[PDB]
Design an enzyme around this catalytic site. Structure first.
Site, short mmCIF file in Angstrom:
data_model
loop_
_atom_site.label_atom_id
_atom_site.label_comp_id
_atom_site.label_asym_id
_atom_site.label_seq_id
_atom_site.Cartn_x
_atom_site.Cartn_y
_atom_site.Cartn_z
CG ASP A 23 -1.95 1.11 1.18
OD1 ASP A 23 -2.01 1.84 0.17
OD2 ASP A 23 -2.70 1.26 2.17
CB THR A 53 -2.20 6.64 -2.47
OG1 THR A 53 -2.05 5.25 -2.16
CG2 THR A 53 -3.58 7.11 -2.03
CB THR A 54 1.06 3.47 -5.64
OG1 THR A 54 0.85 2.83 -4.37
CG2 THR A 54 2.43 3.08 -6.17
CG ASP A 76 -11.07 0.85 -1.44
OD1 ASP A 76 -10.82 1.93 -0.85
OD2 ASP A 76 -10.35 -0.16 -1.34
#
Lengths: 76, 517, 521, 528, 105, 98
Positions: free
Chosen positions: C53, C86-87, C389
């Protein structure tokens, strides 16, 4: 022969990436696995496991040796 | 063996080097915070988690600790510059640093006495002020054009700040705010309320003088034909001038009987308040429950927790008084307003007044995304309204964007034509420092300061002096056509304070510190 | 040639901050995608954790350097808007800093670079809107398929058949045709041990976290009840000063008892006079919340009492119920209450969870609570993040209509279209706007690297299909090659990529705008 | 005892280090000696930064263990008490005598022979300067006040005062005339109270014939002015250390009421104690009330209806200035009141200054008093404090002028004439003092060279210029251009220094130079 | 160096800067050039003034007043080709430098 | 132009460095004399120059100080030409000395 001195990316700890950690993962799991390689099978032999107090014990059981085996690296 | 006990000693050659390098280092910190295209400076404390990013020149200078006493002088001078206007504190410090940077050349290689350097800047500063007078252009007629000038001034003051995004909406917000006053420059007439939520363009200008605190426990949310009484009194445990009597009892039941004497004498004090015939009661102190219940039963609305700033603003809107004497219904001035309405803005009760007595005062309610955006928008709007208030008393304006400093640099060179010998290079050093300000403005924009400012110098030198540095297209265009102007009172304060800041540091050839305790 | 010497070098501070910040994205770029490689992190306490994550690694990395700390706020802002990717937002920032590193080597000032990415990002968003395929909230078939295929990467693949329309219906109930930002925090996910995954309910009004009354006479259910939030605590009088109570006699014990029971009863009577069927008391471990003597009084009055309400719920309970907090019994009135249609305690295999429906209030607004059931802790946990999500996927379609084909396809197509549009410019507008398109190629590169595919080969194949064809062609890890990602049901909403370049341009700006770092106390 | 941490200097190394250390300490105030002299940053032990060029403040700010430099501090200490003007130049003049003495020591001259040389050179230079002095107060008296006004403008031109200095020079002249009579000719600086406040403009600084404080009346509704009240005697003011009210404890109160008995009693007593203390003002027959302790709300209301203004919390020193000017006394209690202990004055009023919220008060006389209070205003703090000392230096200038009518011009004109007279008489003595007189003449030349270095002029070129213009024409005083006037000859530029001030400067500086030469051994121990 | 380090101006432009500035200095000498063709008696004094400037900074500056008329009259006796082979220098020891004479033979 | 502005201005500064060095070798004050020499020649009356004897500024025509036109023109020419040659060189390569 080691991996250190990143000299960049200011952080509160060391960082190892690339083929450096890929070699550390092999060297760590090798020394841990070499312990029970001689105890495999009925012809295998036992070994002495010494504690920090100075006592010890001897058993040929692989489940007991691995439970009493102290592995420093997280890969092992 | 003199001095002693960890004191710091400076000498002739030592203090002059320490004062010049020390002041330039202070100027080198904020040199990139000047101009709308400038850059942000990061500061970090010992905790290391409190690091904050801000481009404010005054905030950077006050935060950074300095070991140079000559550098601490510029910090106090920057605070004086922030008190009079609140902007341009960076340009004053940088210009004072450029004068000291050239002063090192005036001493070392130029063979000039330091008093002549001071007398050189004195004759050169008067030439810069005379250049601003000759280039001062004011419009008293055509208030529609003077209103556009206030918008152009607002566009320059809102630069370098987060407000530059919505500045087109904020320029009309700050301009219309000053137009609703038309009067005393006191900024207490303009109250700033910061609200979370929505874009910054959602901010509105309310002439109704919104109050941040509500009234009463349970009372109607709209007051009609209100009679306002401003009061400062203690509403808790009231026995008037009976002071000196305590409660000594052997049982709690006997204490409650004496506590009823507190409320009985309080109700008589409340009965004297209702004799005023007020529909609204504003108290500076807090209010206990029981007397608040008696105010509700009498129909008088109770407003509590009004600070000193709130009372002074009420005095400029409704025209009330402190009124610390409740001892008689007459000889007291009472304020009034048409409507007091309780409104909800950003999940919080407010009071929106309406129909006050000749209200010149307004309230700006800003809608921000976060607390950090609002906290920076406070001083950003406060510094712009402080300049617009000064433009009402002085209507003269000059063209900014490096043009004003370039026109002065020519007159300083013009007055340098007839001058004595040793004062010549000192006055020429002041003119070069006037050209160092637009040079740094182009450095922060990313353009070429050498080629562009020199083309601006050759354009202003021969006739046709209008245009100045354009930080957008990268060419030389008219500042009047681009909407870039500056107040005359602002520049004469910069040329003065920076010259006065230089005279103080040029007079110090030594620093002596007493034994610390 | 001979130019400005620059004796003092502040550029070394900016160049070191870019290299240090790019070193973050160098480690994060390998965690992108389902085939991404995990990262080992050892906390200062000695705990050994591992995960892919991006938002979790940046949180547990213990980042010190301030410029690298800014990427944490970027990943937090990426989760605050899109909730996913977010990556990828850190990877895009790393390439823009790497591209700006080559821009600084050409002698371009970072202020021009910062403003160059502004016009490049604002135009890149407009280019993305040109290729976007517009959808509508009136079609629930596309909304379920978008939420179902997004949950195939989650512990429960098969149960997403009933989970996808639940997250869709939960948003559509509270979202009208035109709404910009629909708050997902207004949707409360309450997980409870017991039950199964097939059992899930969407409760209109609200659901609580606690039981009601375990003592004698607990109603456990009430119809047409009024609810309020009590921040007060019902206790016998306890003066803060020094006090002592000495009882040596039986009559002295009953005297103190009857006086306390009378004070507790008066508080209970004022609640009954306010017509309050259900009470919610804020959890306080400091002193006693409600005495057991007061519980027996409220039990005879037939008033439902629910204690031990966490402070996190207090803020939400004042929203869905539309009521007002109660600081004291004196300000405790009927006007501050709600009107609840039914208040009952649902017991499923020793659960005894309480739910409330029928807010029936004018202050009512888009607030819905959802009950999550399950056996193991890994069930109610993953299910909570699975819906959270899925709620973000629907929120992206409500804010910006339409979705784009994922798999690195939009990053390449925007890079190709903007590069051709940069040839029509002049001067500086030609040079830098080419580097911004080349920085967009890092996203499909890391996808091909993490999946084992050839970097150079796959990118040239997608750049080949985007000249003739369109966005539909992208990387698919299921086919282990380049194919149509629209038929493979890989769908990325437009807001994720829109909020990506936008937050990336603001991060690179805030970096280049920092010319130095000074210690200030 | 305690042999360790003990240093001793004797013989060869004594006569060297003593002169070199004196030159190092004096070199700081040398550049600061003049109207154009450079300022100095002085950091207090608390960390406060002050900037001033005054050598007396420098030596007072300098904390050092050097005993030779302590003798220089003692020089400025006696110079400040006796005169208070040339404290900066008296040390530089002494350092010039020490530097010339070191050159004579290297020639083999005994230290007493140098000390006896500077003594005979001083007495010779005093007589030559005494013949060249002129009289001001002679003839017309208005001509004296004319030169006295323009003499204050000279001392105030080196300060920020120089802007509005025309009005500030009048304040120094009007202050010395009020506290002095033509027959007595005694100027006491304690009789002139130096006081200043921030705000407004500097040009609003005035001079009051009586004490002026900054105070606000205890109640806002009290009248701002106090009239003589239709034929009464002056205006009676009361200074008491006890408030008018029922007495109250100043540490803790805590009065426990056991029963309604004491409650009803204290309710009636304290209510009646209000008027009993207010009637004490009419018993004394006083108008303005000034107390050390505050008043209650009822006390301010009762004094409001009786037209009795009250002022609370006035400092002890401020009460002394009122008692001296108004011929009043500090009365400990309310039972000692009388009509002979009240302050007698013509008018008391609260004067408002522009929009400033200070609203000070003025106690007037309308006849010449024995004491006055200098009133100073300014737009900034440091400007006010600088104006207070600038006028204080002017009070020292006007004091020596009225004390000794003989005056001599200055700014470097007097020291050169003193040097030319010693250089001519040095050949007639034919003794060891011949080298001491030439060194004394060169030491006097240090002052005009130091002023030339601070003004941006060649110290060697100006010194030869100051001499050449005073030879070919006449010995008449010719000054230096330091103030940037049209030309030399201060006589036309009206730069005047007191003869008694210049005589004490050349004396104490010569005496200190001899005392240093009289010390050939220094023994310094540790600090217990 | 100031045109490079503290300026940022290209060196070829600096070369072009000198070329335009040097031509301005050459035009300044042309406009300020003052020559006397008339009054050869006054032009003779000008040659003496030129000689005193050339003889300055050199050991000949002592007697230059005698040497100025020495070198001036030496050129006047030619009135013709500027070739210096018509002038020979013979160095003799003894006497002051002012004892030097001019022989046309 | 922009980049030629400072280059032309620096050329005039170098021309004022010759009288500054001339006053330095004489021992007088170069800052006072040369600066007063510029202000006096600037507005009207261009005659006078640095007098190395008395220390003041007097007329060069009256003192008999003149220079040849061809001599001074060769100084301004070759110096500006030699400066462009040395400034143009960005690299020095020295072979192996034999």
């Amino acid at each position: 022969f080691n991996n250190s001195r990143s000299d960049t990316l200011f952080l509160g700890g060391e960082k190892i990436s690339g083929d450096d950690i890929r070699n550390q993962n092999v060297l760590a799991t090798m020394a841990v696995a070499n312990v029970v390689k001689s105890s495999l099978g009925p012809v295998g032999l036992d070994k002495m496991l010494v504690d920090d107090i100075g006592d010890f014990t001897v058993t040929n059981d692989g489940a007991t040796i691995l439970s009493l085996l102290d592995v420093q690296h997280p890969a092992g | 063996q003199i001095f002693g006990d960890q004191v710091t000693e400076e000498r002739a050659e030592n203090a002059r080097l320490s004062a010049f390098v020390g002041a330039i280092a202070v100027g080198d910190l904020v040199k990139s915070t000047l101009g709308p295209k400038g850059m942000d400076k990061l500061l970090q404390s010992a905790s290391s988690n409190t690091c904050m990013v801000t481009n404010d020149g005054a905030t950077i200078l006050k935060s950074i600790p300095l070991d140079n006493p000559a550098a601490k002088v510029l910090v106090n001078i920057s605070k004086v510059q922030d008190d009079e206007v609140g902007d341009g504190t960076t340009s004053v410090t940088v210009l004072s640093a450029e004068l000291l940077r050239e002063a090192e050349k005036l001493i070392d290689q130029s063979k000039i006495h330091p008093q002549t350097i001071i007398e050189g800047y004195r004759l050169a500063s008067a030439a810069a002020l005379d250049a601003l007078t000759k280039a001062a252009v004011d419009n008293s007629h055509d208030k529609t054009m003077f209103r556009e000038d206030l918008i152009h001034i607002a566009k320059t003051t809102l630069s370098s700040k987060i407000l530059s995004q919505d500045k087109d909406h904020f320029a009309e917000l700050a301009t219309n705010a000053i137009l609703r006053l038309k009067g005393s420059t006191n900024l207490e007439h303009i109250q700033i309320i910061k609200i979370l939520g929505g874009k910054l363009s959602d901010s509105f200008l309310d002439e109704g003088f919104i109050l941040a605190k509500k009234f009463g426990n349970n009372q109607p949310k709209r007051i009609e034909n209100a009679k306002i009484l401003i009061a400062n009194t203690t509403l808790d445990t009231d026995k008037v001038k009976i002071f000196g009597t305590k409660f000594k009892v052997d049982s709690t039941a006997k204490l409650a009987q004496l506590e009823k004497a507190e409320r009985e004498k309080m109700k008589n004090k409340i009965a004297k308040i209702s004799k005023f015939g007020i529909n609204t009661f504003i108290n500076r102190q807090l209010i206990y429950d029981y007397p608040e219940q008696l105010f509700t039963d009498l129909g008088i609305n109770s407003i509590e927790h009004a600070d000193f700033e709130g009372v002074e603003r009420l005095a400029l809107v409704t025209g009330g008084e402190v009124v610390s004497t409740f001892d008689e219904p007459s000889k007291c001035k009472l304020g009034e307003c048409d409507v007091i309405e309780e409104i909800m803005l950003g999940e919080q009760p407010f009071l929106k007044f309406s129909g006050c007595k000749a209200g010149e005062a307004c309230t700006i309610v800003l809608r921000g995304a976060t607390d950090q955006t609002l906290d920076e928008a406070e001083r950003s709007l406060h510094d712009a309204l402080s300049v617009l208030s000064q433009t009402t008393k002085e209507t003269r304006t000059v063209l900014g964007g490096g043009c004003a400093e370039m026109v002065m640099s020519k007159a300083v060179d013009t007055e340098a034509q007839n001058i004595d010998g040793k004062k010549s290079l000192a006055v020429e050093a002041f003119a070069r420092a006037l050209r160092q300000l637009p040079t740094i403005l182009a450095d922060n924009a990313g353009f070429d300061s050498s080629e562009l400012v020199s083309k601006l110098r050759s354009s202003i030198y021969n006739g046709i002096s209008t245009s100045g540095l354009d930080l957008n297209n990268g060419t030389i265009a008219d500042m009047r056509q681009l909407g870039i102007v500056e107040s005359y009172k602002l520049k004469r304060a910069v040329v003065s304070s920076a010259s006065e800041a230089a005279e103080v540091l040029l007079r110090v050839d030594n620093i002596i510190r007493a034994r610390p305790r | 040639n001979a130019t400005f010497k620059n004796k003092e070098k502040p550029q070394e501070v900016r160049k070191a901050n870019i290299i240090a910040a790019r070193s973050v994205a160098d480690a994060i770029r390998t965690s992108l995608g389902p085939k991404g490689m995990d990262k080992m992190i050892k906390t200062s306490r000695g705990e050994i954790i591992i995960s892919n994550d991006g938002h979790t690694i940046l949180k547990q990395m213990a980042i010190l350097h301030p410029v690298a700390r800014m990427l944490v706020e970027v990943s937090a802002a990426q989760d605050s808007e899109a909730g996913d990717g977010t990556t990828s937002v850190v990877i895009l920032t790393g390439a823009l800093l790497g591209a700006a590193e080559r821009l600084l080597n050409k002698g371009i000032h970072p202020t021009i670079i910062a403003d160059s990415f502004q016009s490049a990002a604002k135009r890149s968003v407009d280019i993305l809107l040109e290729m976007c395929h517009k959808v509508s909230l009136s079609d629930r078939e596309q909304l379920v398929r978008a939420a179902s295929t997004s949950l195939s990467s989650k512990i429960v693949s098969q149960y997403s058949s009933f989970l996808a329309p639940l997250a869709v219906d939960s948003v559509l109930k509270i979202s009208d045709e035109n709404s910009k930002n629909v708050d997902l925090n207004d949707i409360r996910l309450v997980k409870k041990v017991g039950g199964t995954i097939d059992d899930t309910e969407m409760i209109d009004g609200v659901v609580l976290t606690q039981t009601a009354i375990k003592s004698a006479g607990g109603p456990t259910r009430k119809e047409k009840a009024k609810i309020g939030l009590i921040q007060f605590q019902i206790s016998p009088p306890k003066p803060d000063t020094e006090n002592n109570i000495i009882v040596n006699d039986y009559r002295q014990m009953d005297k103190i008892l009857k006086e306390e029971r009378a004070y507790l009863l008066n508080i209970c009577k004022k609640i009954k006079k306010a017509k309050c069927n259900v009470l919610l008391i804020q959890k306080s471990i400091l002193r006693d919340a409600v005495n057991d003597l007061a519980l027996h009084f409220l039990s005879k009055l037939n008033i439902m009492v629910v204690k031990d309400i966490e402070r996190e719920e207090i803020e939400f309970l004042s929203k869905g119920l539309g009521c007002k907090p109660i600081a004291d019994i004196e300000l405790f009135t009927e006007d501050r209450l709600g009107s609840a249609d039914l208040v009952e305690e649902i017991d499923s295999d020793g659960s005894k969870i309480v739910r409330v429906t029928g807010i029936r209030n004018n202050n009512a607004r888009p607030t819905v609570s959802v009950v999550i059931r399950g056996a193991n802790n890994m069930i109610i946990d993953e299910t909570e993040r699975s819906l959270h999500d899925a709620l973000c996927v629907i929120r992206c379609l409500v804010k910006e209509r339409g979705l784009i084909a994922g798999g690195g396809a939009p990053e390449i197509e925007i890079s190709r279209r903007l590069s051709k549009e940069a040839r029509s410019m002049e001067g500086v507008q030609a040079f830098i706007w080419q580097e911004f398109a080349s920085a967009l190629e890092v996203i499909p590169t890391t996808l091909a690297e993490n999946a084992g595919l050839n970097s150079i080969k796959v990118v040239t194949e997608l750049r080949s299909k985007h000249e003739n064809g369109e966005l539909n062609d992208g990387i698919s890890v299921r086919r282990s090659g380049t194919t149509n990602t629209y038929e493979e049901h890989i769908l990325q909403p437009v807001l994720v990529s829109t909020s990506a370049i936008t937050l990336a341009s603001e991060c690179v700006k805030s970096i280049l705008r920092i010319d130095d770092i000074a210690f200030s106390r | 005892k305690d042999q360790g941490n003990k240093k001793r200097q004797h013989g060869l190394e004594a006569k060297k280090s003593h002169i070199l250390a004196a030159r190092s300490v004096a070199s700081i105030i040398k550049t600061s000696l003049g109207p154009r002299g450079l300022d100095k940053i002085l950091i207090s032990p608390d960390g406060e930064i002050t900037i001033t060029n005054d050598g007396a403040t420098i030596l007072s700010q300098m904390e050092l263990d050097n005993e030779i430099a302590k003798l220089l501090v003692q020089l400025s200490k006696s110079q400040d008490d006796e005169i208070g003007d040339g404290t900066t130049g008296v040390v530089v003049l002494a350092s010039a005598l020490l530097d010339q003495a070191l050159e004579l020591i290297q020639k083999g001259i005994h230290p007493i022979k140098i000390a006896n040389g500077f003594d005979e050179a001083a007495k010779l230079a005093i007589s030559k300067l005494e013949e060249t002095c002129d009289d001001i107060s002679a003839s017309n008296d208005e001509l004296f006040r004319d030169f006295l006004l323009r003499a204050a403008k000279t001392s105030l031109g080196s300060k920020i005062v120089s802007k509005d200095h025309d009005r500030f020079a009048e304040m120094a002249v009007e202050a010395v005339i009020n506290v002095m009579d033509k027959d007595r000719k005694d100027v006491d600086f304690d009789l002139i109270k130096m006081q200043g406040r921030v705000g407004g403009s500097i040009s609003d600084s005035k001079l009051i014939n009586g004490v002026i404080l900054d105070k606000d009346f205890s109640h806002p509704q009290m009248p701002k002015c106090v009239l003589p009240k239709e034929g009464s005697d002056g205006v009676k003011l009361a200074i008491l250390t006890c408030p008018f009210e029922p007495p109250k404890p100043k540490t803790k109160h805590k009065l426990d009421i056991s029963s309604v008995e004491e409650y009803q009693k204290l309710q009636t007593y304290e209510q009646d104690k209000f008027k009993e203390m207010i009637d004490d003002v009419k018993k004394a027959g006083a108008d303005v009330v000034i107390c050390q302790w505050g008043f209650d709300d009822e006390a301010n209301h009762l004094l409001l209806q009786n037209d009795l203004p009250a002022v609370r919390w006035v400092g002890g020193q401020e009460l002394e200035h009122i008692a001296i000017s108004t011929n009043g006394r500090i009365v400990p209690r309310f039972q000692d009141l009388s009509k002979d202990k009240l302050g007698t004055c013509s008018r008391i009023y609260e004067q408002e200054f522009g929009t400033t919220k200070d609203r000070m008060l003025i106690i007037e006389q309308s006849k010449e008093t024995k004491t006055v209070t200098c009133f100073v205003r300014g737009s900034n703090k440091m400007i006010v404090d600088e104006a207070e000392r600038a006028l204080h230096d002017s009070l020292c200038v006007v004091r020596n002028l009225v004390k000794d009518s003989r005056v001599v011009y200055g700014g470097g004109a007097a020291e050169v004439t003193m040097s030319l007279a010693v250089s001519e008489e040095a050949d007639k003595q034919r003794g060891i003092d011949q080298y001491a007189f030439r060194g004394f003449a060169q030491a006097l030349d240090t002052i005009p060279m130091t002023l030339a270095e601070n003004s941006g002029l060649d110290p060697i070129g100006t010194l030869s210029t100051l001499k050449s213009k005073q030879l070919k024409e006449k010995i008449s005083n010719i000054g230096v251009d330091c103030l940037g006037y049209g030309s030399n000859d201060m006589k036309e530029l009206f730069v005047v220094d007191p003869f008694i001030g210049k005589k004490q400067q050349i004396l104490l500086a010569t005496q200190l130079c001899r005392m240093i030469l009289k010390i050939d051994n220094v023994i310094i121990s540790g600090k217990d």
